C-alpha cells in the first residue's frame, strides 16, 4: 500500500536503473564560488547625440570583468498608437566592438531585429519589446526610456566576461551609429515628423569586481577565450510579379567555423517589415476597413507569422558547387530548423539554417568552416507575386508558390553568419587568433 | 625557338603559378595572422603585471 | 540603347572536357531563342493570329 | 570542329577537348588549379519588333 508497493517491486529491468546506484536526487552537493560583486555604472559618450550622428564611448577600466552592456535611450513618440515598431533598436543603427582599437565584432539594427526573431524567445522577447517599443497603446507625446541590451560574445554567459584585469594595454571601446530615420518618432513613412525631439542616450556597463586570490590569478595567467563573431554585408533581390518564379544565386563570402547562417527579406524603407503588406488584420495600415492601404504597414503589427505573405519559395545552399542538402521550401527554414535547433517560433520572412545542434548555446555543437571551402552559394527561388494584396479572398485563399504583389517591395536581402574565433590575452596584450 | 631554346622555353618563358594551394587539401593555411594592435600603449596599466600586490592591497 | 554584359563567376572543379550553356525561357521548356512572327518562330506565325 | 553536327540556335559550346563526344580523354581544363573562372557575356540589343 502506498509508494512502498512500487518501491519494493525491484526487478531485472531495474538493474540498469537503480542497481549499483551512482547518484541520489535528494541530496545536492553545491560548489563554493570565488567572491565577486556585480555593479553597473554609466559611461561617458563622446560626440553629439542625435539622429544620423555617430558617437562612441571608451569603457573606463573600473572593473575586473565586463559583462552586460545596456544602451539607454529616452525618446518622445512622434506619432499615434501603433505607428512604431521596436524604435529603440532602429535608432541603434549599429555597434562596433573594439579591444584596443582593433575590431572584434559589429552588429546592425536589422540583426538585433533578426536575433529576437530567432534566439530570444518567450517572456524575454516580449520584455525585449517592452524595453524597446511602446506596447500599451500609448499616444503621441508619450515619453519613456528604453533599454537596448547588446549581444556581444561576453554578455550572455558570465564565462566569457571580458577580462580587463589581463588587458592592461588594449582599452575596450564601442562605436555607435544612430539612425537618421526612426518610424513613428522622427519619420512616418518617408515624411519627417515636425517637432520631433532628438534622443538622449547613455551606456550602462556591468562591471564585475573580484577579490584578491582570483584577481591575482587573472593578471598573471595567459588567457584564451572562445568567442563568437557576426559576419555581414547586404544585397538586393529580383522579385517578379508574374508568369515566373525567379531564381537568384547569392554568393557567400564568409570565413571561420560557422554555427549557422540566417537571412531575411525586407522593404528597406520600413524597419522590420519581412513580409508583404495585405488588406488583412494587422497586415497593413487600415486593414479591414475602406481606408486600408497596402503600401504602409500598421507598424506596431509589422511582425507576422503568416508565411503566405513571405517572398521566399525555396532555398538551397551549395558547398564548393555541390549541394549541401536538397532543396527545401521557405517554410522549412522559418518553422523547422528553429524547431529542431532553437525551440522557439520564427516570424514569417526570417529564415535560419543551422550547422549546429544547439546554436543558441555557446558550447560548440557543429560548425561549417567557411575558410576551408572554395565557394558556397545561397540559391533562392521566389514565389510569384501575382496575388492582389487588397483582396482577402485572394490573400488568404491561394497556393503555396504564389504570394502578394506587394512582396515585390521586399528587395533587401540580409544574409548573416554567426561564427567562432579565439580571443587571446597574453601578458596584457589582447587580440584575435584568426584574421579571416 | 631553336632546338636548344625550346627546352629552356618551358623552364623560363611559360608563367609560373603564384597561387598553388588549391583552396583545399592545403588551402590558405598561412593567411590568418592575428589581429592585435601591433604593440599597444604600455604606460597606464603596466603596474597590474609587475606591481600587482600593490594594486590588490 | 545598350548592350549589357555579365561576368558570371563559375563554380567548377575537376578536369573539364567542355563548358556549354544556353539561355532559357523558364516558362517554355527547351526554348533558347527569341520568338517572332516568322515560320516556326511563334504560334500562328504568318497569320493574323 | 569538336563534334561534327548542327547545334540549334541558343545553345553554345566551347571545348577544351579535341574529341569531347568520346570518352578517351582528349584534353582537359583542370579547374582544381583555376581559382577564379569567369564567363563574360555580352548581349545583343533587343530592339527588333
UniProtKB/Swiss-Prot annotation, chain A:
Its main location: virion. The keyword Cell division does not apply. The keyword DNA-binding does not apply. The viral capsid possesses up to five major capsid protein variants. They behave as asymmetric capsid components. Glycans are attached at residues 279, 301, 398, 405. Keywords: Capsid protein, Glycoprotein, Late protein, Lipid-binding, Virion. Major capsid protein self-assembles to form an icosahedral capsid with a pseudo T=169 symmetry, about 190 nm in diameter, and consisting of 1680 major capsid proteins trimers. The capsid consists in 5040 copies of the major capsid protein (hexamers), 60 copies of the penton protein (pentamers) and 1800 minor capsid proteins of different types. The minor capsid proteins form a hexagonal network below the outer capsid shell, stabilizing the capsid by binding neighboring capsomers together. InterPro entries: Capsid_N (IPR031654), MCP_C (IPR007542), MCP_C_sf (IPR038519), VP_dsDNA_II (IPR016112). Induction: Expressed in the late phase of the viral replicative cycle. GO terms for molecular function: lipid binding; structural molecule activity. This is Major capsid protein. Disulfide bonds: none annotated. Belongs to the NCLDV major capsid protein family. Myristoylated at the C-terminus. Glycosylated; highly branched oligosaccharides. The pattern of glycosylation sites are unusual. Transmembrane segments: none annotated. It is found in: Virion. GO terms for cellular component: viral capsid. It holds the Pfam family Capsid_NCLDV.
From Swiss-Prot, chain B:
It comes from the Viruses. It is found in: Virion. Coiled coil: none annotated. Induction: Expressed in the late phase of the viral replicative cycle. One of the minor capsid proteins that constitute a network internal to the major capsid proteins and outside the lipid membrane. The minor capsid proteins glue and stabilize the capsomers. Interacts with the major capsid protein. This is Minor capsid protein 3.
Swiss-Prot record, chain C:
Glycans are attached at residue 37. Induction: Expressed in the late phase of the viral replicative cycle. Myristoylated at the C-terminus. Glycosylated; highly branched oligosaccharides. The pattern of glycosylation sites are unusual. It is found in: Virion. It comes from the Viruses. Major capsid protein self-assembles to form an icosahedral capsid with a pseudo T=169 symmetry, about 190 nm in diameter, and consisting of 1680 major capsid proteins trimers. The capsid consists in 5040 copies of the major capsid protein (hexamers), 60 copies of the penton protein (pentamers) and 1800 minor capsid proteins of different types. The minor capsid proteins form a hexagonal network below the outer capsid shell, stabilizing the capsid by binding neighboring capsomers together. The viral capsid possesses up to five major capsid protein variants. They behave as asymmetric capsid components. Belongs to the NCLDV major capsid protein family. This is Major capsid protein. It comes from Paramecium bursaria Chlorella virus 1 (PBCV-1). The chain holds residues 244 to 292 of 437 of the full protein.
From Swiss-Prot, chain D:
Myristoylated at the C-terminus. Glycosylated; highly branched oligosaccharides. The pattern of glycosylation sites are unusual. Signal peptide: none annotated. It comes from the Viruses. It is found in: Virion. Induction: Expressed in the late phase of the viral replicative cycle. The viral capsid possesses up to five major capsid protein variants. They behave as asymmetric capsid components. Belongs to the NCLDV major capsid protein family. Major capsid protein self-assembles to form an icosahedral capsid with a pseudo T=169 symmetry, about 190 nm in diameter, and consisting of 1680 major capsid proteins trimers. The capsid consists in 5040 copies of the major capsid protein (hexamers), 60 copies of the penton protein (pentamers) and 1800 minor capsid proteins of different types. The minor capsid proteins form a hexagonal network below the outer capsid shell, stabilizing the capsid by binding neighboring capsomers together. This is Major capsid protein. It comes from Paramecium bursaria Chlorella virus 1 (PBCV-1).
